[PDB]
Amino acid sequence: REQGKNAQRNNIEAAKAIADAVRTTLGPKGMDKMLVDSIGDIIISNDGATILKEMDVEHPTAKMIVEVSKAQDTAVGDGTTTAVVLSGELLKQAETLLDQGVHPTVISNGYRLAVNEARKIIDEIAEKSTDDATLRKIALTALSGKNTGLSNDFLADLVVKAVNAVAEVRDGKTIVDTANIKVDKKNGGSVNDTQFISGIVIDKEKVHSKMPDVVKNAKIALIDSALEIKKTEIEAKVQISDPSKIQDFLNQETNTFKQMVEKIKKSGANVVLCQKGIDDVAQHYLAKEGIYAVRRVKKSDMEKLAKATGAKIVTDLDDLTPSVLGEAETVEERKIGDDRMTFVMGCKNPKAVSILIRGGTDHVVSEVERALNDAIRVVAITKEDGKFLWGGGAVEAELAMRLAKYANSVGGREQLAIEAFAKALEIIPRTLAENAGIDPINTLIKLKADDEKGRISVGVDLDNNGVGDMKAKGVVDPLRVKTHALESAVEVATMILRIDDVI
Amino acid sequence: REQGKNAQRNNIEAAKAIADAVRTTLGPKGMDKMLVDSIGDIIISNDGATILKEMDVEHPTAKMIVEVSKAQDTAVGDGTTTAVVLSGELLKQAETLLDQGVHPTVISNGYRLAVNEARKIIDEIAEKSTDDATLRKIALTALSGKNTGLSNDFLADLVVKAVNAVAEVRDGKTIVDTANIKVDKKNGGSVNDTQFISGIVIDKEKVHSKMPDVVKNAKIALIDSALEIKKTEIEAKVQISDPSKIQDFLNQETNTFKQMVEKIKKSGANVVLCQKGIDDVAQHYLAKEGIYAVRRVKKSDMEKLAKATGAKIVTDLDDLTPSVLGEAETVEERKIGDDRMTFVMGCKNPKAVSILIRGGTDHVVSEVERALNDAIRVVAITKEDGKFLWGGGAVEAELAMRLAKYANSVGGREQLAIEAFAKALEIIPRTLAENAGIDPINTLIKLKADDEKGRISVGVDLDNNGVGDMKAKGVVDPLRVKTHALESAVEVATMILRIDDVI
Amino acid sequence: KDAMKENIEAAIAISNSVRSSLGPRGMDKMLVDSLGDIVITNDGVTILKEMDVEHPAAKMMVEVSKTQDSFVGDGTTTAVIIAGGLLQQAQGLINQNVHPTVISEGYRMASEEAKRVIDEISTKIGADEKALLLKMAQTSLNSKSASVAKDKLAEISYEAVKSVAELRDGKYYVDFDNIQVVKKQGGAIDDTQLINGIIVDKEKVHPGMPDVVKDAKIALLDAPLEIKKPEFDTNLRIEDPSMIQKFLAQEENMLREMVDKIKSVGANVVITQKGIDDMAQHYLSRAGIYAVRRVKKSDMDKLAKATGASIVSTIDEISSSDLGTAERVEQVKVGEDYMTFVTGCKNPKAVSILVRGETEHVVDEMERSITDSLHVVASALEDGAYAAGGGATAAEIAFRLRSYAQKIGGRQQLAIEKFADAIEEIPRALAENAGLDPIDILLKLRAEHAKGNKTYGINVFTGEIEDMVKNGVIEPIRVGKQAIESATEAAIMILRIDDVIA
Amino acid sequence: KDAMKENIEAAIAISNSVRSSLGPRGMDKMLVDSLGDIVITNDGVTILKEMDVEHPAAKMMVEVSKTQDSFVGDGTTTAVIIAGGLLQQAQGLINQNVHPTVISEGYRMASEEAKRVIDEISTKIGADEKALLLKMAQTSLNSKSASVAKDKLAEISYEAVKSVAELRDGKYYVDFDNIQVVKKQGGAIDDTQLINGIIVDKEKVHPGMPDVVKDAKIALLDAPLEIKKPEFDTNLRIEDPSMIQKFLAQEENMLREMVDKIKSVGANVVITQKGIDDMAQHYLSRAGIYAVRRVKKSDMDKLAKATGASIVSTIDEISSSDLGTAERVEQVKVGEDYMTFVTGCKNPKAVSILVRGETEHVVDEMERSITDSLHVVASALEDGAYAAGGGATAAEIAFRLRSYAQKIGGRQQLAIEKFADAIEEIPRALAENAGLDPIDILLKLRAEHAKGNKTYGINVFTGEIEDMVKNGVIEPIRVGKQAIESATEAAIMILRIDDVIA
C-alpha cells in the first residue's frame, strides 16, 4: 500500500515506462519489438496493440494503460501507440502541476475542457472526401512503418479494391462490413503474389482424391453435423444371438452412410462443406456420386460461406432441401504454396471477397497480414465517415496552437491544466522527429511557425528533414481513430491521476 | 518491565519463595541446608543469615528480602529467619487486601500502626533480669536447633563465662565488647574439648625450633614491619670495583639483622609477635638470644593482643622502648590437634579471653563455631539490656491477640491492615508447629486460649505436643533481636508493597 | 484498557483509509487483490468490501458501518468517517475514566436527537421536482470520475427513474427491476445512453436466426431445450439392426416436437436461462425463431417484468398466457459485441442504460457512478424531502447537539458534546480534501449556524461558506439518517468490548 | 506527520511511566539495570535518570523535563506529567491543521501568564514560619515511603535548614555545604538523628591512635603523607656498604620530619584526601595524633567550612593559620561501622543528619526522601512564599488561562485553552492515584475555583475538595514555576521537530 505523493509519483512513473515500451513504433520509421515467451515463442511486430496485449506488464497502473489495446475504436494502426504515448505525457505534464500545488481534480477538469475543445477543432478542420484516391492514401499511410517491402502501392490498391467491393449503401449512408473481406495467408514467397479473389478462399482440401478438382455451377450444401455414425442419447446395447445378425448389423451401418449421401444427392447439391468430420465410407460414396466435399470447416468460414453463397447452414439432413443450397459458378481446388486450398467463386452474393497473402518467411507474412488488416480497417472507416486528417503530427500541432490560446479564455487553475494538455500534444510530433533521427527541438520550432502562419497541413517530413506539407506527400490519418485516441488517453489519465492510495 | 497487578502479585510471589527457602530452619527442630558452589564448595548450616548471604537469588524483590541478612541488629540467631518469614507473610496477607480494593499505602499505614503498637507491647511485657541463670537460658535457647551434639549445657556455660569475663561497667551501665572474646576452632574431636582460655590464643607456631616452648613473665613486642632487608624508595644500585667489597656487602646485611635483634633485646622484650615475615637470619639471632618469635600474625590478632597485653603496635624499631611492651605471665606454644598454637596468658588486661572449639568433622566445628558466635552475641545483648522475652511463639501469640483488639480502636481501612498484621504474626507459632511435626491448626487454637486466659509465657511445646509454659522449659528470646526482626520485616514489606512497576 | 486501545486504533485506521475520498475534491482508491484483480473506485461500499482487513475490530467496523440498509450516495463513507470520529473522541473520555456505558448512552441519545434535527430541518420537494432531482444527481456525480459528464448522466438518471416510478398513495415507489444497467467499452463516456426497453448482452444462438422480429411474442424458459432421460436406469435393447434407425428418429422427433409446442403457442422469440441442443438450434432457426441461451437470471427477471412473460420450466405445459410482448426484438452491434435489444415492451415502465467508457476499468467505474445516481434520485423521490450538503446539515446537527447536551446535563452531556465534535468530522474532511483550512472553515461554519443559517455549507470551489441549496448541493434526507444510524452502532459495538479472545 | 506522531508517543510514554508516583497515594518504581543494580524509588529525578530510554524524543523529554534548575519536591514529576499533557493536546490541534508554530506561541504565552497567576495567588510566609515550613516538609515526606516517620523527619529537616540559614538582606540564604547527610543501615527509620557537627564515615588510620581528642586543631590535607621522589630520573649510587644504612635512615627521617611540621604547628588531627604511608601512620600514632585517610573531597569541603581550616597541598608550607577548630573529634561506632564525629565546630552553622534504615535499599530511599525535605523547606525559606498543593494552584491556573485565552483570541487561544486542559493533568493524576473519580473531582474543582476558591484542592484522604492551606498541604512557590517552565520547553522542542535523521 502507498499513500499520497508516493502513490501518485509512482503511478505516473509506471505509465511513462509502458509508453516508452511502444514509443519507437510510431510512424514510417518505426522499429519492431521481438516478444518471446516460453512455449509458442517469438512474435515480431510494429503493431502497438499486439505488443501491449502480449507484454508481461506487472504493475497495476501499467495494466491500466495496456487496456487501451482492447478499445476496438483506438487499437487500429498507430491509434494504440498514440493513445499510450499521450497518456504518458498527460500524466508526466500533470506531475509538474501537482508539484506547484494544483489539485488532481482541477487538472482532470482542465484535461476535460481541453479534450472537448480539441474534439471540436478536429471536426472543424476535418477534410472531407470519399475519393478512392484518398482511400489509397489512407492505406499507404497505414502500411508505412511495417516490414512489407516495397509492394505497398500494390497492397494499398488491393485494400481499396476489397473495401469498395463489399461496401454497401443503407439509407443514404455507406456501410462496410469488414467481416465480408476474408484475409488469409500462405508462406509462398513474393508478396506481389498476394491475390484478390472474388469469392471465399478456404484453407481446406477436398476429403477424397477421387473427388473432382473443379465443380462448375455449384449447388453448395453447408452442413453442421458430422457425416458419421450417431449413437442414441439414452444408452443402447446391441445383442446378437444369431451369428447371421453380425453381418446385418455391419450392413445397417453401410446403408446408413449410403442414405446420408442419397439425401445430399436428392437436394441437387454437388458440393458439401461440412463443419465436422466425414466418415471414410461416406467419403467413399460422396466421391462415387461425384460430390466435392470438405470437412472440419471453421464456423467462421461456415458463416462467411452462408453469407456469400446464400446457403442455409443445415444440421438435420432431412431439412436439406434445394431451398437451403447456396450458389457459386466455380468450386475448385488448387495448390497454393505447399497446401491445396478450396476456392468458392462467383458466389450468389458479390459482396464477399478474399485476399490470399504471400511472403515467405512466415514471420513476415504474419505482420503483413497484421498490416493489411489494420489497413482494411482504416480504409473501411474512412469510406464510411468520408472525412480524414493530415498526418505527421500536423493535427497535434494545430491543436497544440489553438488550445494554447483557448487556455487564456479560461480561469486560473484550469488554464494551467489546459496549457499542460497543449504541451502534451507536442509529444507526437517530437516522437516522429526522434524516430526519424532528426532534431526534435528545431522541428517543433518550425512546425509551430508554419501552422501559425495558417499552414494546417504541415507535418514532420523525414525527406525535407524537418517539417513539410503532408497534403503533397499524402500522409493522411482517419478521423475516428484520432478522436478516440485523444479521448482514451484522457479518460485513462484521469482514472490514474485521481488515485491517492493503492492498497 | 511489569506494571500494576502483574508487577505486584509477582513481587509478593517472589518474597514468599525466598521465605520458604529458610522456613524449616526455625527452632529447636530446625533442619539444615546444604549450599554447594563451584570451587570452594559445600556449606551446611542452620544459620539463616549464612544461608541467605550464600544463596544465589536471581529476582530483584528476592534480592531485597535477602538484604535482611546484613542488618547486623536482626541477623543473629533466628532473627533472620523470623524477619524473612514475617515479610513473606506480611506481603501474603496484603495480597488479600489489595484484592478487596485496599490501597497499598493504607496497608502500609496499617502495618506502621501495628508495628509501632507491637514495639510498645513488648517493652511493656519484657521480663527484666541480669541473672546469670537467665543468661544461660538465653544461650541454651540460641544453640537449640544446631548440630552441636548434647554438649549444649557445657557450651552455654562457656558463653556466660566468657561474656561475664569481658563485660564492663561504664557510667552505671554494662557494656560487653564481644571483640574481646577470641573464638577459634581446631578439628580435634570431642567438643567437650572446647577450652576457655584466659588469654589470647593464636593459631601460629614459633618461627624457629631453637626458640623456647614457654616464656614466663613475658615482655611482649608487637611489630608492624617485616624483620627483613629493606630497600630504599628511590632506586639504588650497588657498584663493586674491589673484589674485597663483595664480602663486606654480604656482611652489612648480616650485621643489619644482628642490629634489628639488638634493638629488640635492648627493650627487654623476650617475645616478638610480628605481623609480617621474619628473615631466616633474623630468626637465627632471635633464637640465639632466646626471644620467642611468631610471624605473619593477623592484624585482627595484632589488635586483640595490643588490647590484652597493653603493648603498643610499633613499626619503627627505634621507637621500641620498654614503654610500648605488653605483659603476660606466660607465652607458651602447645600442640592442639595436629597444629602447634601460641598461647598468651595472664595478660595485663583481664578483659580478654579465648574459646578454642573442637569437634572433628570440620563441617561441624564450623557450624558449632557459627553457633557459639551467635550465642555469644545474644548473651552479650541481654547482659546489656537486662531484659528478655518468652520463646516458642509466645511473644507473637500475645501480640497477635492484642493487635487484634487494637485494630477495633482504629478506622476502617487501617483496621483491616492491622487485622492482617495480627494474622501474619501467627506464621511464627505455626512454623514451629509444622517443623516439630505437630498439628499447626490445633496448636494455634490452644495457644490463643491460654494467652487470652492471661498465660503470657505459653509457647509451642514439642514435648507436651502442642502448647506449654516456656517459663518452665526456659526458652527465652533476647528483646533487641525481636523488635528489630519486626521492624526490618515492616520496612522491607512496605518498600516492596509500594512498587507498581518494575522496569 | 489495551484491548480497547488496540480495537479503537484498528477501527480509526479504516476511517482514515476512506476519508480522502469524500466529496467534490475527493480522490479514489486502487485496490489490488492476491489474484491480481484491480478495482479503482471512489465508491466507499466497494472500497470497504474490497480492502483486506485482518483485525477483528476492523472487520466489524466495515460490517456495521456498511450502512447496509441502503447504498444511496456516500452514506457508507460518511458513516465510516463519523464512526472513526465518535471512537477517537471516546478514547479521550475514557482517558478521564468515563465509563464506556455512559458514553454509549450519550451516543445513543445524541444519535436520536440528531435524526430529529434532520427531520426538522429537512425540506420537502415541491413543484420543483425536476430541477431538484437533477441538482441531486449532479452533486452525486460530482464526487466521482463521472463528474466529467455530470449534466448528461444526471439527465439520464432523472429520466430513467422518473420512467419507472409509480406514484401510488400520492407517493412514489421505484422498482429497480425496471432499470437495466449494462456496460460496454469502446465508446466515450458521452456515448452513454438511455434505451426505452431491455437490453440483453447476448446474441442469437444460431447464425441462421433473424436479426430482427417485429411484434415479438417472447417465450421465457428456465429449462434447457434437450432430450429428457428417465430418472430410473434406462437402456435401449437393440436386437434388430433396423431399430437403430427408428431409435435415433425418435430422439430427433422429441426435440422437433418441443420446438413445435413453443411455436404452436405463437412464440416468436425464445430466451432461455439454460442450454439449447444443437439440433434444437437447427429447428428453431428453421422455424424462423430468434433464440438466445444461457441468459442471466437477473436478466430473465427483468424481461418478465417488461414483457409480462412468465418464466416456464415445463415446456410441455407452456401456453400463450405465458408469452411476453414487445414491439420488436433485434440484434444490434454495440461496439465489438452483438446484443439483443427488446424494445417497445408491454410494460413501458422498463428502461435500460448503456454505459460506455473507452477502457474496461473506466466503464466499470462509470456504471458504479451511474448506479449511485439512480439510487440518489430514486430515494429523494421516495422520501419526498432533501437536506443541504456541503457539511451544512452536519454543522447544524452539531450546533443543535451542543444545546441539547446542556439540557441532558451530567456525564451523558460529555458524550453528547463529543458526539457533536465527531459529526464535525464531515466538514473537516471536506475542507481538508479541497485544500482549505479546516480550523478556519469550521469556525466560520459554526458562526453562520449559530446565527441561524441552517443551509450554510462549504463551497469547495470558491472556498466560502454559502447557502448549499441555492448552490444546488443537496442530498436525500435518507443518507444522513442512515449514516448517523450506522455510525453510532459501529462505535457502540467497539466501545462495549473489553477483551478479544480465541 | 509521522515523525511527529512517533516522537509525541515516545514522549507521552515517559509521562505515563511516572504518573502513578505523584502524591500521597503515589507508588514507587523498581529499576533494575543490565549490571543488575536495583533502585526502588519515588523520586522522579532518579526514576528518569535511571530508566533506559532509547528513542531520541524520550531522551529529550527526560533531559529538558528534568527541571534541572532545582530538584525541590516533585518539580520534575510534575513537569513531566504536564509535558505529556501539553503534547497529547497538541496532537489533537495538529489533527485539525493548526500549525505547530501557533501552538508553540500559544504555549509560550500561556506559560508566561501561568507564572504570573502563581506570583499573584502565592502567599508570603509570615510570623508563621515554623508551623508553615513543618507543614511543607511533611507534605513532601507524605509522598515517600518516609511518610511512616514524617513528623520526626520533618522536624529534623526544619531544625537542620534553620541552623545553616543566613538571614542576610532581611532575606534567607541556605548553603548546603553546611548540611552533611550520611546514611547507615542497621537501625530503624526512627533512629535517624541530627548531630550538631560533621560526621565522616571513616575511622582512625592506625589502631594506636586515640578514640577522642578534646579541643582539636584539625589539619586538612590534600596531599599524601609519603616520600617525594624527584621529577628528574634519580638513582642512589652505593659503593660503600655503610651508606646503605645512612640512606634508609634519610628516608624515614623525611617522613618523621613531615609529621614534625604538622605537629609543630599545633595540629591534633590530620585528615587527608590522599594516603598515609605506614611509617607515617606509626609516627602520627606515636605523636598521639588522630588521623583519617582517603577522605571524600566533598567531605573535605564540608570540614573546611565547619572548622575553618584551609585544605593544604604543600605540607612543607603548612601553618597554624591553616588549622581548623572543633571542641572534640571522636571515633564512635554507628551500628557495625566506626565513624569520626567532629563536634562543636568553629562554624556552628554546620550540621549532620545520620539517616538510618534496617536494610540498604531502605536507608537509600530514606536519604533520598530527607534530601528532598531539606530542599523543600530551604527553598520556601529562600523564596518567602508558598502556594497551595492538592491540585489547587493548578486548578486555579487552569481557571485563569481559560479567561486569558478569550482575551488573546484567535488560533493562539486554542493553544492556550489546551494548555489549561494540560495543567489539569495534575488534579487528574492525583485523583486517579488516590482511587477517586477524576471526571467527578475535576468538575467540583472547577466549580470551587470559579466561585473564587483559590486554595481549594483534592484531599485524597477524605476525597473531598477543601482548603489546602488550612489542611496544611502546601509547597514552595518555586516548584510550580519551574515545573511549568520545564514542561513547556520540553513540549515546544518536540513540537518543532518534523524529522529525525542520522
Give residue limits of the domains in chain A.
Answer: 1-127+387-503, 128-197+351-386, 198-350
Q: Within an 8 Å CB–CB cutoff, is residue B288 touching chain D?
A: no
* Cβ-defined contact of C29 to A501 (cutoff 8 Å): yes
Task: Tally Cβ neighbours within 10 Å of residue B318.
Answer: 11
Task: Determine the Cα–Cα distance for residues B201 and B352; give it in Å rounded to an integer.
Answer: 10
Q: What type of residue is C230?
A: P
Residue C415 DSSP class? H
Q: Within an 8 Å CB–CB cutoff, is residue B298 touching chain D?
A: no
Q: What type of residue is B433?
A: A
Task: Determine the Cα–Cα distance for residues A317 and A304; give it in Å rounded to an integer.
Answer: 21
Which residues touch C73 (CB under 8 Å, ≥6 apart)?
Answer: C140, C372, C375, C376, C475, C476, C479
Yes or no: say if A7 and A499 are a contact pair by the CB < 8 Å rule. yes
- Count of helices and strands (H, E) across chain A: 17, 21
Residue B161 DSSP class? H
Q: Within an 8 Å CB–CB cutoff, is residue C359 touching chain A?
A: yes
C-alpha cell at A267: 437436394
Q: Dihedrals φ, ψ of A94, to 5°?
A: -65, -45
DSSP calls for A84-143 = HHHHHHHHHHHHHHHHHT--HHHHHHHHHHHHHHHHHHHHHHPEE---HHHHHHHHHHHT
Nearest to B23 by CA among B68, B66, B84: B84
Length of chain C counted residue by residue = 502
Which residues touch B401 (CB under 8 Å, ≥6 apart)?
Answer: B422, B448, B451, B452
Q: What type of residue is B190?
A: S
- For the CA atoms of B467, B471, B473, B476, the dihedral, rounded to the nearest 10 degrees, stands at 100
Q: Is C195 helix (H, G, I), strand (E, B) or coil?
A: strand
Yes or no: say if A273 and A302 are a contact pair by the CB < 8 Å rule. yes
- Subunits in contact with chain B (3 or more CB pairs closer than 8 Å): D
Which residues touch B10 (CB under 8 Å, ≥6 apart)?
Answer: B2, B61, B502
Q: Helix axis angle, C100-121 relative to C477-496, nearest 10°? A: 180
**Pairing mode of beta strands A292-294, A271-274:** parallel
Last residue of a domain, one of D383, D409, D433: D383
Whose cell is 626471644? That residue is B291
- Three-state SS for A399-439 is HHHHHHHHCCCCCHHHHHHHHHHHHHHCHHHHHHHHHHCCC
Size of interface B-D (CB pairs under 8 A): 166
Task: Give the CATH number of domain A198-350.
Answer: 3.50.7.10
Question: Containing domain of residue C245, as a range?
Answer: 196-347
Yes or no: say if D401 and D416 are a contact pair by the CB < 8 Å rule. yes
Do residues D262 and D307 both lie within one domain?
A: yes
Report, in this order, helix, strand and coil percent for chain D, each rounded to 5. 50, 20, 30
B238 neighbourhood in chain D, CB within 8 Å: 238-239
CATH number for the domain that contains residue D143: 3.30.260.10
Task: Tally Cβ neighbours within 10 Å of residue B290.
Answer: 12
- Three-state SS for C314-358 is CHHHCCHHHCEEEEEEEEEEECCEEEEEEEEECCCCCEEEEEEEC
**Pairing mode of beta strands D179-185, D351-357:** parallel
| Helix boundaries (H) for B67-131 | 79-100, 104-125
Nearest to A304 by CA among A220, A214, A371: A220
Task: Determine the Cα–Cα distance for residues A498 and B12; give it in Å rounded to an integer.
Answer: 61
Residue C227 DSSP class? P
Task: Tally Cβ neighbours within 10 Å of residue D313.
Answer: 11
C-alpha cell at B94: 496484603
- Exposed/middle/buried for D231, CB within 10 Å: 0-12, 13-18, 19+? exposed
Task: Determine the Cα–Cα distance for residues C129 and C109; give it in Å rounded to an integer.
Answer: 34
C-alpha cell at B164: 561475664
Task: Determine the Cα–Cα distance for residues D163 and D196; give it in Å rounded to an integer.
Answer: 9
Last residue of a domain, one of C347, C368, C392: C347
Task: Determine the Cα–Cα distance for residues A107 and A413; give it in Å rounded to an integer.
Answer: 8
Q: How was this structure determined?
A: X-ray
Task: Determine the Cα–Cα distance for residues B498 and D23; give it in Å rounded to an integer.
Answer: 13
Do residues C150 and C257 both lie within one domain?
A: no
Do residues D200 and D340 both lie within one domain?
A: yes
Which residues touch B65 (CB under 8 Å, ≥6 apart)?
Answer: B15, B18, B19, B52, B84, B87, B88, B492
Yes or no: say if B285 and B265 are a contact pair by the CB < 8 Å rule. no
Do residues C332 and C202 both lie within one domain?
A: yes
**Pairing mode of beta strands C179-185, C351-357:** parallel
Task: Determine the Cα–Cα distance for residues D106 and D111; give it in Å rounded to an integer.
Answer: 8
Report, in this order, helix, strand and coil percent for chain C, each rounded to 5. 50, 20, 30
Nearest to C19 by CA among C70, C72, C88: C88
Sign of CA dihedral A229, A231, A237, A239: negative
Q: Within an 8 Å CB–CB cutoff, is residue D347 touching chain B?
A: no
Do residues C366 and C414 both lie within one domain?
A: no
Sign of CA dihedral D398, D400, D406, D408: negative
- Three-state SS for C192-228 is CEEECEEEECCCCCCCCCCCEEEEEEEEEECCCECCC
* Cβ-defined contact of D40 to B500 (cutoff 8 Å): no
Do residues D200 and D338 both lie within one domain?
A: yes
Q: Within an 8 Å CB–CB cutoff, is residue B302 touching chain D?
A: yes
A249 neighbourhood in chain C, CB within 8 Å: 241
DSSP calls for B225-251 = S-BSPPPPSS-EEE---STTHHHHHHH
Size of interface A-C (CB pairs under 8 A): 166
Q: What type of residue is B494?
A: T
Task: Determine the Cα–Cα distance for residues C352 and C199; give it in Å rounded to an integer.
Answer: 6
Q: Within an 8 Å CB–CB cutoff, is residue A58 touching chain C?
A: no
C-alpha cell at B452: 487470652
Nearest to B396 by CA among B368, B375, B421, B371: B421
Q: What type of residue is D214?
A: K
Yes or no: say if D243 and D265 are a contact pair by the CB < 8 Å rule. no
Nearest to A400 by CA among A374, A433, A423: A423
**Pairing mode of beta strands D28-32, B499-502:** parallel
Task: Determine the Cα–Cα distance for residues A480 and A459; give it in Å rounded to an integer.
Answer: 19
**Pairing mode of beta strands B214-223, B353-357:** unpaired
Give the bridge partners for B168, in sequence order.
Answer: B175
Sign of CA dihedral A164, A165, A166, A168: positive
Yes or no: say if B73 and B487 are a contact pair by the CB < 8 Å rule. no
Task: Determine the Cα–Cα distance for residues C83 and B312; give it in Å rounded to an integer.
Answer: 91
Distances in Å between the alpha carbon of A412 and those of B158, C16, C23, C26, C459?
Answer: 112, 31, 22, 21, 18
Whose cell is 524483590? That residue is B61
CATH number for the domain that contains residue C72: 1.10.560.10
Q: Dihedrals φ, ψ of B185, to 5°?
A: -135, 160
Nearest to B193 by CA among B162, B224, B164, B158: B158
Do residues C165 and C205 both lie within one domain?
A: no
Please calculate the CA angle A148-A150-A156 and round it to the nearest 5 degrees.
75
Compare all CA atoms of chain C with the CA of A230 and give the residue at the minimum distance: C248
Distances in Å between the alpha carbon of A200 and those of A162, A195, A196, A309?
Answer: 12, 12, 10, 9
Number of structural domains found in chain D: 3
Do residues C214 and C87 both lie within one domain?
A: no
Element housing B357 (H / E): strand B353-357
Whose cell is 470497504? That residue is C48
Task: Determine the Cα–Cα distance for residues C291 and C46; give it in Å rounded to an integer.
Answer: 36
Q: Within an 8 Å CB–CB cutoff, is residue C208 touching chain A?
A: yes
Find which of C359, C367, C368 to mutate to test the A interface (most A CBs within 10 Å of its CB): C359
Task: Determine the Cα–Cα distance for residues B135 and B131; give it in Å rounded to an integer.
Answer: 7
What residues of D are annotated to the active site?
43, 76-77, 372
- Whether chain B lies against chain A with 3 or more Cβ pairs closer than 8 A is no
Do residues C294 and C305 both lie within one domain?
A: yes
Nearest to C391 by CA among C423, C419, C359: C423
C189 neighbourhood in chain A, CB within 8 Å: 491
Element housing A284 (H / E): helix A280-289
Q: What type of residue is A369?
A: E
C-alpha cell at A21: 515500451
Which residues in chain D (161-190) have CB-CB distances under 8 A to chain B?
Answer: 185-189
C-alpha cell at A378: 482504416
C77 neighbourhood in chain A, CB within 8 Å: none
Q: Dihedrals φ, ψ of D239, to 5°?
A: -115, -15
End-to-end CA distance of chain D: 18
Whose cell is 598461647? That residue is B343
Do residues C364 and C337 both lie within one domain?
A: no
Q: What type of residue is B160?
A: V
Active site residue B32: no
Q: Is A211 helix (H, G, I), strand (E, B) or coil?
A: coil
Yes or no: say if A485 and A119 are a contact pair by the CB < 8 Å rule. no
| Whole-number CA gyration radius for chain B | 29
C434 neighbourhood in chain A, CB within 8 Å: 103
Residue B278 DSSP class? B
Do residues D185 and D204 both lie within one domain?
A: no
C-alpha cell at D21: 508516583
Yes or no: say if C457 and C390 are a contact pair by the CB < 8 Å rule. yes
CB-side neighbour CA atoms (13 Å) of C173: 7
Q: What type of residue is B23?
A: R
Element housing D136 (H / E): helix D129-141
Task: Determine the Cα–Cα distance for residues A344 and D209; give it in Å rounded to an integer.
Answer: 139
Which residues touch D160 (CB under 8 Å, ≥6 apart)?
Answer: D179, D194, D351, D353, D374
Which residues in chain C (428-447) have CB-CB distances under 8 A to chain A?
Answer: 434-435
Yes or no: say if D356 and D334 are a contact pair by the CB < 8 Å rule. no
Yes or no: say if D15 and D9 are a contact pair by the CB < 8 Å rule. no
User: How far B7 CA lies from chain D's nearest CA (Å)?
Assistant: 10
Distances in Å between the alpha carbon of A273 and those of A180, A223, A292, A293?
Answer: 19, 6, 8, 6
Q: What type of residue is C350?
A: A
Distances in Å between the alpha carbon of B338 and those of B186, B296, B335, C435?
Answer: 9, 20, 7, 100
Task: Determine the Cα–Cα distance for residues C370 and C41; give it in Å rounded to an integer.
Answer: 13
Task: Tally Cβ neighbours within 10 Å of residue A159.
Answer: 30
* Cβ-defined contact of A494 to C145 (cutoff 8 Å): yes
Q: Dihedrals φ, ψ of A293, to 5°?
A: -120, 145
Residue D165 DSSP class? E
A61 neighbourhood in chain C, CB within 8 Å: 30
Task: Determine the Cα–Cα distance for residues D258 and D264; give it in Å rounded to an integer.
Answer: 10
Task: Determine the Cα–Cα distance for residues A425 and A114; give it in Å rounded to an integer.
Answer: 11
* Cβ-defined contact of C414 to D439 (cutoff 8 Å): yes
Selecting from 3.40.50.880, 3.90.79.10, 3.55.50.30, 1.10.560.10, what CATH number does the domain A1-127+387-503 have?
1.10.560.10
Whose cell is 437495466? That residue is C180
For residue D235, give the nearest of B225, B235, B251 by CB distance. Answer: B235
Whose cell is 458440393? That residue is A271
Do residues C335 and C212 both lie within one domain?
A: yes
Task: Tally Cβ neighbours within 10 Å of residue C78.
Answer: 28
D434 neighbourhood in chain B, CB within 8 Å: 103
Nearest to B332 by CA among B318, B344, B321, B323: B344
Yes or no: say if A374 and A183 are a contact pair by the CB < 8 Å rule. no
Q: What type of residue is C214?
A: K
- Three-state SS for C228-295 is CCCCCCCCEEECCCCHHHHHHHHHHHHHHHHHHHHHHCCCCEEEECCCECHHHHHHHHHCCCEEECCC
Task: Give the CATH number of domain A128-197+351-386.
Answer: 3.30.260.10
Yes or no: say if D458 and D427 are a contact pair by the CB < 8 Å rule. yes
Task: Tally Cβ neighbours within 10 Å of residue D410.
Answer: 12
Distances in Å between the alpha carbon of B166 and those of B141, B161, B163, B352?
Answer: 22, 9, 6, 6
Sign of CA dihedral B268, B273, B274, B279: positive
Task: Determine the Cα–Cα distance for residues D202 and D209; give it in Å rounded to an integer.
Answer: 14
